[PDB]
Every structure is written in C-alpha cells, then in structure tokens.
Coordinates of C-alpha atoms and ligand atoms in Angstrom, one line a residue:
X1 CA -195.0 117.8 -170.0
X2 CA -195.2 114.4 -168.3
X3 CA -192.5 112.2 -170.3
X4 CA -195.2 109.2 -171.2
X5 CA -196.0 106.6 -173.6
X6 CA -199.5 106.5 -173.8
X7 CA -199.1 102.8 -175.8
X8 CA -197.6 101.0 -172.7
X9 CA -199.4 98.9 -170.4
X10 CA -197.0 100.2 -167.6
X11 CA -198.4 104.0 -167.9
X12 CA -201.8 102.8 -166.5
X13 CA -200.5 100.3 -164.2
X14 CA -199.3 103.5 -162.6
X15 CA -201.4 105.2 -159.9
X16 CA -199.1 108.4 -160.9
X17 CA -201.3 108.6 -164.5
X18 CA -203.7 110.4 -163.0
X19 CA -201.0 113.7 -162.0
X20 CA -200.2 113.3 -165.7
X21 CA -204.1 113.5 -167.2
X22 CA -204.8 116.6 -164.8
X23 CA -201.3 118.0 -166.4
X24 CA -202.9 117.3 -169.4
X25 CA -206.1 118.7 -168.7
X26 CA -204.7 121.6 -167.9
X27 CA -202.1 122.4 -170.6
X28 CA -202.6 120.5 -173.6
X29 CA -206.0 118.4 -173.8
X30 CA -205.7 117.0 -177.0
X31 CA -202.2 115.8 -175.7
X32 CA -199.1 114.4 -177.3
X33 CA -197.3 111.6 -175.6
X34 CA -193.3 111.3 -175.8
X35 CA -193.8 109.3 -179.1
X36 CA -196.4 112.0 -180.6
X37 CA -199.3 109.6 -180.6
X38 CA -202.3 112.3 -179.7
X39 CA -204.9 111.7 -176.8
X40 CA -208.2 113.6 -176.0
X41 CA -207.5 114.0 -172.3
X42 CA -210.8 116.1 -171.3
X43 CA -214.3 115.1 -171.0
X44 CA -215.5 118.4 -173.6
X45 CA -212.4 116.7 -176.5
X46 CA -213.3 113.3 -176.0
X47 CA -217.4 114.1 -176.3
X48 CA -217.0 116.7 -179.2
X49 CA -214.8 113.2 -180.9
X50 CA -217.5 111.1 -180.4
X51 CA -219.9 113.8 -181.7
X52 CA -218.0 113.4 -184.5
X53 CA -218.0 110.2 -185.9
X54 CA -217.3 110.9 -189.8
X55 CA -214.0 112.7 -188.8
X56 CA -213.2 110.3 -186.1
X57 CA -213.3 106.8 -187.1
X58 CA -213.7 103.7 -185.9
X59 CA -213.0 101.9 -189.2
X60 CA -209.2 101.9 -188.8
X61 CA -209.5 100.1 -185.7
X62 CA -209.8 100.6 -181.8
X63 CA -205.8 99.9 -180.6
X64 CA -202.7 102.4 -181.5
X65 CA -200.8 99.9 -183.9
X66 CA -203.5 97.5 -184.9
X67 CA -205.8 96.9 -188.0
X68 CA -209.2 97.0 -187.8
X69 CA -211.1 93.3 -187.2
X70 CA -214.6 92.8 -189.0
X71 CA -216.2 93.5 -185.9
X72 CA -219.3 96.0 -184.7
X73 CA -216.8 98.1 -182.8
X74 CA -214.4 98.9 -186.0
X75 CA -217.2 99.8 -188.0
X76 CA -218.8 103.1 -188.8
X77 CA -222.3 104.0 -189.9
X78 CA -224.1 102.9 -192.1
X79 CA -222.8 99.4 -191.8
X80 CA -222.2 99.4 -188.0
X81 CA -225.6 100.3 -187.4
X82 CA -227.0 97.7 -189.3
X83 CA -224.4 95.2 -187.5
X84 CA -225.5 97.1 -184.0
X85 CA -229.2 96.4 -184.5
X86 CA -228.7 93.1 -185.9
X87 CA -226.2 92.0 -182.2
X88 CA -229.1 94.4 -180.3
X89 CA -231.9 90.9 -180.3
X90 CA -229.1 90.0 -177.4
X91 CA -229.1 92.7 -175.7
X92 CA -233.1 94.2 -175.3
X93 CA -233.8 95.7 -172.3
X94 CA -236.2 92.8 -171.4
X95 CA -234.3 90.4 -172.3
X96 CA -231.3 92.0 -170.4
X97 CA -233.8 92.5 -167.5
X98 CA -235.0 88.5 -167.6
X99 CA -231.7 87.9 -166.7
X100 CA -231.8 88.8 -163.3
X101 CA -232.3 86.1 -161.3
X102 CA -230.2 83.6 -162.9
X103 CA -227.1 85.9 -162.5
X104 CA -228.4 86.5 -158.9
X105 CA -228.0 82.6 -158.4
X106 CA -224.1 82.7 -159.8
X107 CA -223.4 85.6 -157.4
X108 CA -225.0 83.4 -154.1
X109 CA -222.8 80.2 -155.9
X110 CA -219.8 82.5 -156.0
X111 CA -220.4 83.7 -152.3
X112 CA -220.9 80.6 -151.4
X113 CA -217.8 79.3 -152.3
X114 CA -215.8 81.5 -149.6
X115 CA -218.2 82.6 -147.4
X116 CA -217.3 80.1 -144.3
X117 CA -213.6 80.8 -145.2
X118 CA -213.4 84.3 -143.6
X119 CA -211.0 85.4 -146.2
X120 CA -210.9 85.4 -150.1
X121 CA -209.0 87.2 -153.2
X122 CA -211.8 89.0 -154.0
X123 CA -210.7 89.5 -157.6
X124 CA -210.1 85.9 -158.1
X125 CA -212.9 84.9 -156.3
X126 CA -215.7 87.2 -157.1
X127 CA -215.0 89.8 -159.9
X128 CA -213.1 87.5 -162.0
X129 CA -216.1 84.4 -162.3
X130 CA -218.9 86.3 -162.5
X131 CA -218.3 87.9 -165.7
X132 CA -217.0 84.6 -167.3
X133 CA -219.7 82.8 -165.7
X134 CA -222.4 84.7 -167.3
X135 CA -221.2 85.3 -170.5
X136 CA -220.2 81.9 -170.6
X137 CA -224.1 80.6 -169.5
X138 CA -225.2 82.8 -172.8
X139 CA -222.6 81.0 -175.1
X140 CA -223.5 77.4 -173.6
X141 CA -220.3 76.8 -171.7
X142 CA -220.8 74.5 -169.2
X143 CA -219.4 75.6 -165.8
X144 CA -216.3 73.2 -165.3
X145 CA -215.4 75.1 -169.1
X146 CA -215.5 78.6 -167.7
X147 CA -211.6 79.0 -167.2
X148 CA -210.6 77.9 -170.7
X149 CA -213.0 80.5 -171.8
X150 CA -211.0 82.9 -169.0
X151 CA -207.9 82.4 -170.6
X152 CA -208.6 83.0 -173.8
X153 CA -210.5 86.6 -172.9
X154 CA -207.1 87.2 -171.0
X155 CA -204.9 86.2 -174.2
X156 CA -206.9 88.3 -176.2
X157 CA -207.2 91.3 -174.1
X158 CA -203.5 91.3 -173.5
X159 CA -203.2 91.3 -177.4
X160 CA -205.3 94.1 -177.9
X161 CA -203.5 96.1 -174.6
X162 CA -199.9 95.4 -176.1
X163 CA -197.1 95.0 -179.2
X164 CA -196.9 91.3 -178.5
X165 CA -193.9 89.3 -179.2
X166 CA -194.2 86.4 -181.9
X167 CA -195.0 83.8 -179.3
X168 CA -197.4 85.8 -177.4
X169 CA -199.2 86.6 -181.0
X170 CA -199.4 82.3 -182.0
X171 CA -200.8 82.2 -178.1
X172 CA -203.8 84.4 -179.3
X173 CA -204.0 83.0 -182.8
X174 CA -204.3 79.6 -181.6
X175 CA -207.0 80.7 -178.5
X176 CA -209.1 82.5 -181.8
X177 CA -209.1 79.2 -183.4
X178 CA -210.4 77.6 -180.3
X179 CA -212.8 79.9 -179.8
X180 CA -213.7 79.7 -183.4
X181 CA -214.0 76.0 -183.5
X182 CA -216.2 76.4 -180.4
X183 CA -218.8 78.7 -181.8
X184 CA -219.4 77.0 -184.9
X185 CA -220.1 73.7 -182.9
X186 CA -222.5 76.5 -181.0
X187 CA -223.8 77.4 -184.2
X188 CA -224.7 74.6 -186.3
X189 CA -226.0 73.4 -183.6
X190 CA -228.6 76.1 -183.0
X191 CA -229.7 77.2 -186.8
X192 CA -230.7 73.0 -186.6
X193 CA -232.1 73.0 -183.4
X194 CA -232.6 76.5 -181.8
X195 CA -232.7 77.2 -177.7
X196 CA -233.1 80.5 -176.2
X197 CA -229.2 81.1 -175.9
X198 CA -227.8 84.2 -177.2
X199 CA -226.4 82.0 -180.4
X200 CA -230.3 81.2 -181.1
X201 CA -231.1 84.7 -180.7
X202 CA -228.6 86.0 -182.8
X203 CA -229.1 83.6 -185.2
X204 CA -233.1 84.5 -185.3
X205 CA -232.0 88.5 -185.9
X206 CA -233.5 90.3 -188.8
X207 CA -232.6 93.6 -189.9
X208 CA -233.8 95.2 -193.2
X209 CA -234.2 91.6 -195.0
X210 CA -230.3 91.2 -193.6
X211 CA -228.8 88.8 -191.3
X212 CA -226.1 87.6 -189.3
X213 CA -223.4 85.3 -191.3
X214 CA -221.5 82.4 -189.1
X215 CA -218.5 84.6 -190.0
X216 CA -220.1 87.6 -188.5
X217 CA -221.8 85.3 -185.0
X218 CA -218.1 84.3 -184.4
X219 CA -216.8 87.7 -184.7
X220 CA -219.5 89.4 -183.1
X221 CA -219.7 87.1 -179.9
X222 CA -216.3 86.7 -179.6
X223 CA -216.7 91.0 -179.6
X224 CA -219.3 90.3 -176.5
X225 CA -216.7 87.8 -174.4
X226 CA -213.7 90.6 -174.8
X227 CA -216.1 93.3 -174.1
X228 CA -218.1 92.0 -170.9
X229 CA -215.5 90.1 -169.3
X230 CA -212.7 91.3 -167.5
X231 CA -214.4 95.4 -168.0
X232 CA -217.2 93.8 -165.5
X233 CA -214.5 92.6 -163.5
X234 CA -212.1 95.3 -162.9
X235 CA -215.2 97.8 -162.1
X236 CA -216.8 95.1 -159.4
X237 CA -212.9 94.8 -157.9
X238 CA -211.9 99.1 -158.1
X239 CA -216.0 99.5 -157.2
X240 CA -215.8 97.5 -153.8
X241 CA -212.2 98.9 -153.2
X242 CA -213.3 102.4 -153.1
X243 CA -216.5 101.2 -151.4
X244 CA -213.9 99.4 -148.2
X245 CA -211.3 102.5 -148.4
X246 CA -214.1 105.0 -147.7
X247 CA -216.2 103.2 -145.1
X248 CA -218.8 105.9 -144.9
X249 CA -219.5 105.0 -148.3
X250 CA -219.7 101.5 -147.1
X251 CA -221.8 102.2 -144.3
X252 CA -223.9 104.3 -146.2
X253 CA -224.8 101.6 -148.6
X254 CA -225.4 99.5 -146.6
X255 CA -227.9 101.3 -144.3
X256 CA -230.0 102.3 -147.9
X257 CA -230.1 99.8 -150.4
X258 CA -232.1 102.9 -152.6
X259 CA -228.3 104.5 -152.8
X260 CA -227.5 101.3 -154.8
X261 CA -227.8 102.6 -158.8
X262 CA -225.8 105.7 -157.6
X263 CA -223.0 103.8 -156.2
X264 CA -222.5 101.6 -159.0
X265 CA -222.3 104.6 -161.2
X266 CA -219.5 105.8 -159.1
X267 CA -217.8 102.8 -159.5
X268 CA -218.3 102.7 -162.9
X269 CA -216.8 106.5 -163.3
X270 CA -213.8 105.6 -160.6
X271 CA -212.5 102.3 -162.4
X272 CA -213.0 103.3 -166.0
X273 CA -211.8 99.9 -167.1
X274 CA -211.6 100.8 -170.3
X275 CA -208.7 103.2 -170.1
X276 CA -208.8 104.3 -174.0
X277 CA -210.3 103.3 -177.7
X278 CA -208.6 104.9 -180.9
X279 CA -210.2 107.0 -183.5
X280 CA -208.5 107.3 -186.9
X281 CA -208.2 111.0 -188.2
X282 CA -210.5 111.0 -191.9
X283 CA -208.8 114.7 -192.5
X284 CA -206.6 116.9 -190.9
X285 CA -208.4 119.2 -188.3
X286 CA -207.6 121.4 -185.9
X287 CA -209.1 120.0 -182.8
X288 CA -209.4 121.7 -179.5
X289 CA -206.2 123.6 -179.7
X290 CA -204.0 120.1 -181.3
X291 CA -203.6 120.1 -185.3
X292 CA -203.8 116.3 -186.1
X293 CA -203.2 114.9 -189.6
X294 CA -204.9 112.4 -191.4
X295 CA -204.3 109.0 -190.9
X296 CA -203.1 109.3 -187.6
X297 CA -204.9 107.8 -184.5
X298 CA -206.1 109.7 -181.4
X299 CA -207.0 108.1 -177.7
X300 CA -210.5 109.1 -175.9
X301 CA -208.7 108.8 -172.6
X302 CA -211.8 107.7 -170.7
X303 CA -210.3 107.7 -167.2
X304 CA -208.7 111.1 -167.5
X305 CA -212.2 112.2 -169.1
X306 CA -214.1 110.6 -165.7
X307 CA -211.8 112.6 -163.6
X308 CA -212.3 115.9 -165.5
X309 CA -212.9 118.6 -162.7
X310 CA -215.0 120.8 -165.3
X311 CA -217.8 118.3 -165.0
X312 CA -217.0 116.5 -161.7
X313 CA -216.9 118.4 -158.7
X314 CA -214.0 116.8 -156.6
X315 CA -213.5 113.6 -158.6
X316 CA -210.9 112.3 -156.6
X317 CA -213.4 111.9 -153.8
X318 CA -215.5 108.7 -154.3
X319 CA -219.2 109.7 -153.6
X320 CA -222.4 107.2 -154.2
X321 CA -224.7 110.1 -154.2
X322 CA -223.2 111.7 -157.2
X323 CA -225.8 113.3 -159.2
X324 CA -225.1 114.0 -161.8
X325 CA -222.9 111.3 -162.9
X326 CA -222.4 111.6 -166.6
X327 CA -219.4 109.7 -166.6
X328 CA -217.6 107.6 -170.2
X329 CA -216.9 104.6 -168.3
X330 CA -219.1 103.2 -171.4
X331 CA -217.9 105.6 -173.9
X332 CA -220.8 108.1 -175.9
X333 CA -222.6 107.6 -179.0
X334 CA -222.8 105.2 -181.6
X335 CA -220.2 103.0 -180.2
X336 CA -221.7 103.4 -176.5
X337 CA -221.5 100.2 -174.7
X338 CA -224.0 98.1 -176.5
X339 CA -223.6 95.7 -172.8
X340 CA -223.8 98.7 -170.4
X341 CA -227.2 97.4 -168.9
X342 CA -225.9 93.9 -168.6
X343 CA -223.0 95.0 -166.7
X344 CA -224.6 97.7 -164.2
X345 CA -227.6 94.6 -163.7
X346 CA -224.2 92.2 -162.6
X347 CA -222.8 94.8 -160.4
X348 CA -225.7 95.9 -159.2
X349 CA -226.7 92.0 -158.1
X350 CA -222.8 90.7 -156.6
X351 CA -222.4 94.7 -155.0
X352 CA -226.1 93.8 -153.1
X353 CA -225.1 90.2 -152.1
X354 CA -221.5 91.4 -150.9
X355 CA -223.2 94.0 -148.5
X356 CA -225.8 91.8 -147.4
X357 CA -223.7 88.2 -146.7
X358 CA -220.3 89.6 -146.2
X359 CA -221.4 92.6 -144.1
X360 CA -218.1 93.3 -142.0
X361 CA -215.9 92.8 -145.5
X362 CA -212.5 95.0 -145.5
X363 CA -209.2 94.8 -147.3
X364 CA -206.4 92.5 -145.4
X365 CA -204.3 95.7 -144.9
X366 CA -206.0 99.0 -145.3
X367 CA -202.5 100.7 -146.1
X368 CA -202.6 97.8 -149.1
X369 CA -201.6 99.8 -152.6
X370 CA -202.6 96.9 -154.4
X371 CA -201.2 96.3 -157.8
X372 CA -203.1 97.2 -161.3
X373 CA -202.5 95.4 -164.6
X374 CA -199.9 96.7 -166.7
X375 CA -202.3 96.6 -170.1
X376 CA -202.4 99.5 -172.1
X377 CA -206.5 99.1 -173.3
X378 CA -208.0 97.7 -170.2
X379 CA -206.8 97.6 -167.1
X380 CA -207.8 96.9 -163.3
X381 CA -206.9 95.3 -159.9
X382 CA -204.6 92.2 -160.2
X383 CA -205.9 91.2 -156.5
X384 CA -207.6 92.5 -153.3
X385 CA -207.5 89.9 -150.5
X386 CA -210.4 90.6 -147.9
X387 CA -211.3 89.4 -144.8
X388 CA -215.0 89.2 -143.0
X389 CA -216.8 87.2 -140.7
X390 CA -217.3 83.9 -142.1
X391 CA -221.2 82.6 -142.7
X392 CA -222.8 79.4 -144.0
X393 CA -223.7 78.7 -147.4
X394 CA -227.2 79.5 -148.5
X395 CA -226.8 76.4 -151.1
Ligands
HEM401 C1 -217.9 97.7 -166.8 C2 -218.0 96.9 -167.9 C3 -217.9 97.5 -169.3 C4 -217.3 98.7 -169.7 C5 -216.5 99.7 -168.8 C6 -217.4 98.8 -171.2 C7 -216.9 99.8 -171.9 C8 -217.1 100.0 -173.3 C9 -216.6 101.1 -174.1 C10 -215.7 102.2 -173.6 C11 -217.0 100.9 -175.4 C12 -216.7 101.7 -176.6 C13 -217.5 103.1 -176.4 C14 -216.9 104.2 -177.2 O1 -215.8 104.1 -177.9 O2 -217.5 105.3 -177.2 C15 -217.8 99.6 -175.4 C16 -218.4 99.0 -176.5 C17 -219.0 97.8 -176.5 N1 -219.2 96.9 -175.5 FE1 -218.7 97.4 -173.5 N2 -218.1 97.7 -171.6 C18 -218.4 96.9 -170.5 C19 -219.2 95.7 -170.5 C20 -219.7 95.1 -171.6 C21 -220.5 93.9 -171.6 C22 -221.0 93.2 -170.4 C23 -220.8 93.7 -172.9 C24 -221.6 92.5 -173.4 C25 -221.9 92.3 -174.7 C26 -220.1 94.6 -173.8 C27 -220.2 94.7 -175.1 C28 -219.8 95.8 -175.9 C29 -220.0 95.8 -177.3 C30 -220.6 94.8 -178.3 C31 -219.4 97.2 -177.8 C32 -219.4 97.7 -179.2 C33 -220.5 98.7 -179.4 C34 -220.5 99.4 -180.7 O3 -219.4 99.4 -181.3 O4 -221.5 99.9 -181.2 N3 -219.5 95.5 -172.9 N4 -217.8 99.1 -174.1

C-alpha cells in the first residue's frame, strides 16, 4: 500500500495523492492509512456512507482528532434538520438567485483592479476576494474590513486542516472571539432594527414554533464564512487552471457561453476543495470489504471519489461537456452543501467575466507546477500568476 497519513496537510499538497487514491481504489476502498485511520476512497463507499447517516455520524465531528462544535454540520437528524431549515431562509433559491447582479458588480470591481496591468496572481487577485467579498456584503462588512475577515477564515481553516501547536490554537481562539464580538454587534443590531442582510433573515427564521438563538446565529454564520470562503476560492483558481492548461477547453468556452454550467461542474469535480469530512462509526460494521469499530472515524475522500473511473470515464481528462457529472465536490445527502447554488452562481459570474475581459489569459509559464496548500480538510492553489492583454476599466 501507499505509506500515507491521511491526517497531514502535506498528503494533499501532493500532486502524487492521486496514484495513491487509484491504489486505493483498486485494492482496498475503504482504506487504512499508515496510522489505521480508515478512508472511503470510492465514489459507491463514500455514497452508500452518506446513505447511511444513523451508522455514519456527523455528531462526533467533521476533522480526524477534533470534537464536534454546536454547529449544522456536526449535527444529525432530527436536530440538524431543524437547524438546516432554520439557516435555509439564507439560502432560498430566489433569494440565492437575487443575488446575481450584485456579485456580478464585485467580479467587474475585482477585474478592474488588474485589468490595465497585464498580469495578476490570479488567486490573490480574483479567487481569493470574491468569496470574502460576498460573504462579507451578507454579514455587513464594509469592504476596507474584508481581509480581517480573510484572516480569520484562513486561521480557522488551518485549525480545522491540522493538530495545531499551542500558539497556533490561542491565534484561532482569539480570531473566534473577534468574530464573535463582531456578530453580536451584527446581531443586536438587527433583532432592533432589521435590514435585508443575512443576520435579518436569519434572525426572522421560523421553524416549527422554533428559532435561531444568538448562540446558534454566531455559530451558524461563522459555519457559512468557513464553508463559502476559501472552497469558492480554490475551485475558481484549480477551475481556470484546468480551463488555461487545456486551451481547447478554453477556446471552447469561450466560443459558447451555453457550455458554461458544464464547465463549472468540471471544475467543481476536478478541484474538490473539500478533500475529506469525517464520519464517526455508531457500531461496528463491515463496510465494503473494511471491518470498522465503533467509535472510530472514517474519511469520505471526496477528491479520490470525483476521480473514480467506475463513474467517470477518463477523469484525469478535464472535459466541460461532461454529462453526466455526478460529482461530491459538495458531498451527498443531508449534509449536501447547503451553499452549493451560491457558489456555482459566483463561479459561474467571475468564470464569464474572465473569458469575456481577459480573453487572451494564460499561466506565466505553462510548464508552471504550481504549489497547493499543505491543509489536510481543504486544500487548493497557493498562487497562479497570469498574464493577458491588458484593457481599461469598465468603472
Ligand atoms: C466550491 C465551494 C464549496 C464546496 C466545494 C463545498 C463543499 C461542502 C461539503 C463537502 C459539505 C459537506 C457535505 C457532506 O459531508 O456530504 C458542505 C457543507 C456545507 N456548506 Fe459548503 N461548499 C462550498 C461552498 C459553500 C458556500 C458558498 C456556503 C455558504 C453558506 C457553504 C455552506 C455550507 C454549509 C452551511 C454546510 C453544512 C450543511 C449541512 O451540514 O447540512 N458552502 N460544503
């Protein structure tokens, strides 16, 4: 077997883990890493696990060596789907929708910025803000506030994708209480005087004669930031990668915006951002060929899933016209992505303004292997400078 760790952030920094998921795949897919931590590394293990929520549970927590927060995402049914509908008010496909046009305006801002440059990092530049930036116009943060908000998603992702050392764990208890204090500003605020923000909406949920507590809008939002921020990023940085490696693809989108949906799905399935969530084990079962005990947590390795040649013909070949596409990029079932329409609807909207105003866009070097976060949860580009022919601002 490949000799890995499936808990270290250096594993899927590594554009070798793929050789070790198809090893996987093809000898033991419900694998056990060098340390015995158990992963479901094909797309039938991890689907029948999340078929299977009362034997694989999300109430022990998401991460390998963590306990579980009072959050949507560590919950199981009943009580998470009373918590999902309550969060859902955000998150209605109209309301998702209606938010078109203002994330359309943060994408011409961003472009804007570099556009008469000729060059940019594109994940500085363009994956990185846009998340931030419209997550952070639902919270209220005014703009010149957006990297404090940055850095805290950052702290608190690297906490979640890592054993942190004492000082690193005080860095994301104090950017919590930040956060915190921000939120309940946010909050008094709106249950006094209520906008159409996603605090006011939350706020206004009903469910069943229940509603959100503050406790539950700080944990629940602060949920949304982690989840929608630097996922969104990493799939708009790996999406246009693939998109300026293969420039068929490129040229193909570009000649028919209608190819549009399909190529974000491929983006989506390529980048899998999310490179694993843990279930814990409610009894011992033998799953898929793996006895697992009790107590123990398993991986849904959702990248190794996405590249699963029993469902996806040729998957290391990046193809917009995919169809189907039923990739986990989002994960499956209760727990899918409760944001999965709000980040295809900011992909979708930067991926059409970078093929319309940067048209000639390609890496600085197009024999660049371009470094990935070392993060063992989720994971992406570090950086992908680009070059194009520079334009003026449309202001
Ligand atoms: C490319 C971007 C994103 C990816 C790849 C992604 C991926 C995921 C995955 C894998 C899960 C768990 C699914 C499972 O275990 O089966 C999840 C859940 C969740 N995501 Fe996302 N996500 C993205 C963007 C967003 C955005 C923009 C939001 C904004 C709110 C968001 C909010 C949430 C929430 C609240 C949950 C918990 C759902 C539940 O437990 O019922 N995500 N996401």
């Amino acid at each position: 077997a490949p000799d890995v760790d499936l808990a270290d952030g250096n594993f899927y920094a590594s554009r070798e883990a793929r050789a070790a998921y198809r090893w996987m795949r093809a000898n033991q897919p419900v694998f056990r890493d060098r340390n015995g931590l158990a992963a479901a590394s094909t797309y039938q293990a991890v689907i029948d696990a999340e078929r299977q929520p009362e034997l694989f549970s999300n109430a022990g927590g998401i991460r390998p060596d963590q306990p579980a927060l009072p959050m949507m995402i560590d919950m199981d049914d009943p009580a998470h789907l009373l918590r999902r509908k309550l969060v859902n008010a955000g998150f209605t496909r109209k309301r998702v929708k209606d938010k078109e046009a203002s994330i359309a305006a943060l994408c011409d801002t961003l472009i804007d910025a570099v556009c008469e440059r000729g060059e940019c990092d594109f994940v500085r530049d363009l994956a990185a803000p846009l998340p931030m930036a419209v997550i952070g116009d639902m919270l209220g943060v005014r703009p010149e506030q957006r990297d404090m908000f940055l850095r805290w998603s950052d702290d608190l992702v690297t906490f979640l994708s890592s054993h942190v050392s004492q000082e690193d764990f005080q860095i994301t208890m104090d950017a919590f209480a930040a956060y915190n204090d921000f939120t309940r500003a946010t909050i008094a605020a709106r249950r006094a005087d209520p906008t159409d923000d996603l605090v006011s909406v939350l706020v206004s949920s009903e469910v069943d004669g229940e509603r959100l507590s503050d406790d539950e809008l700080v944990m629940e939002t602060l949920l949304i930031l982690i989840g929608g921020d630097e996922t969104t990023r990493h799939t708009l940085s790996g999406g246009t990668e693939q998109l300026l490696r293969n420039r068929d693809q490129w040229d193909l989108l570009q000649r028919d915006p209608s190819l549009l949906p399909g190529a974000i799905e491929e983006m989506l399935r390529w980048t899998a951002p999310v490179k694993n969530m843990c279930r814990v084990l409610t009894a011992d079962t033998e799953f898929h060929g793996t006895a697992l005990c009790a107590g123990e947590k398993m991986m849904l390795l959702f990248e190794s899933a996405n590249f699963d040649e029993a469902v996806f013909c040729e998957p290391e070949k990046f193809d917009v016209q995919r169809n189907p596409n039923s990739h986990l990029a989002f994960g499956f079932g209760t727990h899918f992505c409760l944001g999965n329409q709000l980040a295809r609807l900011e992909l979708s909207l930067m991926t059409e303004r970078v093929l319309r105003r940067l048209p000639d866009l390609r890496l600085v070097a197009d024999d660049s292997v371009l470094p990935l976060r070392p993060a063992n949860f989720v994971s992406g580009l570090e950086s992908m400078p680009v070059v194009f022919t520079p334009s003026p601002p449309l202001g």
